[PDB]
Every structure is written in C-alpha cells, then in structure tokens.
Amino acid sequence: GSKPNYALKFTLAGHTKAVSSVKFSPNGEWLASSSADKLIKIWGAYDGKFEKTISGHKLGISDVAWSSDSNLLVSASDDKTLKIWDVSSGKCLKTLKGHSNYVFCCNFNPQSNLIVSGSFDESVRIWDVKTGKCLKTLPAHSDPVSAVHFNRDGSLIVSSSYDGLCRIWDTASGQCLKTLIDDDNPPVSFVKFSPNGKYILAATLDNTLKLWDYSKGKCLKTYTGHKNEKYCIFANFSVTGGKWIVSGSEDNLVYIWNLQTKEIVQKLQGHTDVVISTACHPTENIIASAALENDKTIKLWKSDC
Ligand SMILES: Cc1nc(CO)c[nH]1
C-alpha cells in the first residue's frame, strides 16, 4: 500500500550495555550488532536467531560495517583501533592502528579493498583491507567525526562532524571536493550517500534531517517530527517497498517518512531508551532498531508495504 505497516516480529536480547549500531549483511542472511559491552553479535535476519559473539576489542564499539560479499566486518572502538573480522571463523584478521582517540564510525567501499574511519581525533583515515596499513590521514574536521560513507562507485567519501560541516573527499587523492554544509553549528551527527550517489542525507542536532543534491549543493527535502539533540543517530533510505526515510529518535520511537512528501507515515513504539541505530533489509521490508542502556535490545519489524 501507500503507507508501511511495520509490526514488531522479534526482540533480540544479549548485549549487556547500550547497542551502538545494527547493520544487515548485503546477502540479507545476517544482522550484525555492536555495543559499548565491547562485543559484536551476529543474528539471523529473518528469525532473530542468535548465531555468535565476536570478541577482541579492549573497550566499547561505536560502529560495525559489512564487506560487499557479506564475508568480513570492520568495527570501530574506543580502544583507538578498528578490527577486520572473518564472520565465518569469528577471528580478527587485522587490527588497524593510527587514530589517537576513539574511532566512532567506519565503512567499506563497494570494492571492499578500502575501509574509511572517523575518529574523536578529528581525522578521517583510509585503510588497505589486504595489508591493514593506513594509506591516507585526512585532517577532515575540527571536532569529532560523526559519520563516514563511500558513494556507489567508491570515488567519493562523505564525512560529518560536530564542527557543523559536511565534506566530500576524493578517495584517490584524499583532497576535499566540496564543503556541502558550512555552518559553525548545528553539529552534523550523521551523513550518508543515497543508493544512486546523487543525494546526501544529513542529520543535525536540531531535530532535523535534510536531503541534499550533491552536484548542486542545495537542500531538496527536510524531515522533522522526531527528537535528535544529543546522539549520532543513523538514518536510512528504505527502498524494498515504498520509498521512505527511516531514523531513530531520542523519544524512543522509530520514525518513517515518505521521502517525496516529507510526511511522517509511521512511528514504531516498543523501545524503552533512545533508538540510536536503524537498518533496512536489502530485499525484504524489514527494519532493525537498537536502543541505549535502559533497553539494550534490538527489534526486528516487518511490513507488507
Ligand atoms: C553510535 C554511532 N552513530 C554513528 C553514525 O555514523 C556511528 N556510531
């Protein structure tokens, strides 16, 4: 139908501190979760079945991300490292050392030969997956880096920061192509490219999501109604059914907007703390949501539309 009807199907318990991130594997079979409890957990995407715990970080994890082939994970930790993991063996393949403060955010490129990271040390680093070596350190921002993401062909990186900027980087050279958002404030708490790489979705800590045209550097859409003044809350393009924007909220709800009309089309109730992370299944109309330490659960929601 014209609106979704997401309904709670499973609650996934086991983390002992706040959940920080949830991500579906590109092949759709898994959900990965990261937590302040220093653990990664792997769950069945369709039935929430607990699969395994992946351990090794010495402090909390703020983010986890899948390789394009669903075989590897990368995690970003307060221990100042990222780790590359073989999901099947659960083994740490590489530890990526160089950041001088907490690593907050990470992603593979589509090729999955590179990892990008953002840190409280105000830098963005680009890493070689095969060797675990740091290829480039970008002096990207003047405050902690909240998000990093590659576009569809891997040629661009978008970064965001508490400094109030969103910057687009040439992967190959590390050089800045554009400062897309250029304000002293508000802090930019999240950014990512649209699936086709033409748009950037940006969150600011003034309860606002905006959809930007990268090429023209202009705001096309604004989404409001939710609460976001403190946390770096993920947002998503939902593309399997109707074309939605999805975000967590500091009022403990998942918000779903019509991307084109900007109308709120659903609010998902059930969590008992801030919903810091949401993920959209690559093929099925399924949302994963995760909450902070009063809750510590992941919820799987399913829609007909
Ligand atoms: C908690 C968290 N938010 C982000 C957004 O990039 C990374 N980790």
Author numbering: 30 to 334
Q: Which sentences did the original study use to describe this structure?
A:
A “cellular multitasker” with many binding partners, the scaffolding protein WDR5 is best studied in the context of histone methylation as part of the SET1/MLL (mixed-lineage leukemia) complexes. WDR5 comprises a 7-bladed β-propeller fold, each blade composed of a four-stranded antiparallel β-sheet (the WD40 motif). Cavities on each face, namely, the “WDR5-binding motif” (WBM) and “WDR5-interacting” (WIN) sites, are the interfaces key to its scaffolding role. The WIN site is dominated by a conserved arginine pocket, where the guanidine headgroup sits in a “phenylalanine clamp” composed of Phe133 and Phe263.
Removing the methanol moiety entirely leaving 2-methyl imidazole also reduced binding (6, KD = 2.1 mM); however, this aligns with the reduced size of this compound and the high ligand efficiency of 2 is largely maintained (LE = 0.60). A cocrystal structure of 2 aligned well with 1 (ligand RMSD 0.2 Å) and placed the two solvent exposed positions—the 2-methyl and the hydroxyl groups—as the frontrunners for elaboration in the WDR5 channel. From the crystal structures of 1 and 2, it appeared possible to extend from the hydroxyl moiety, deeper into the WDR5 channel, with an eye to potentially form additional interactions with the hydrophobic residues F263, F219, or A176. Synthetic efforts subsequently focused on extending from the 2-position of the imidazole ring to fill the WIN site.
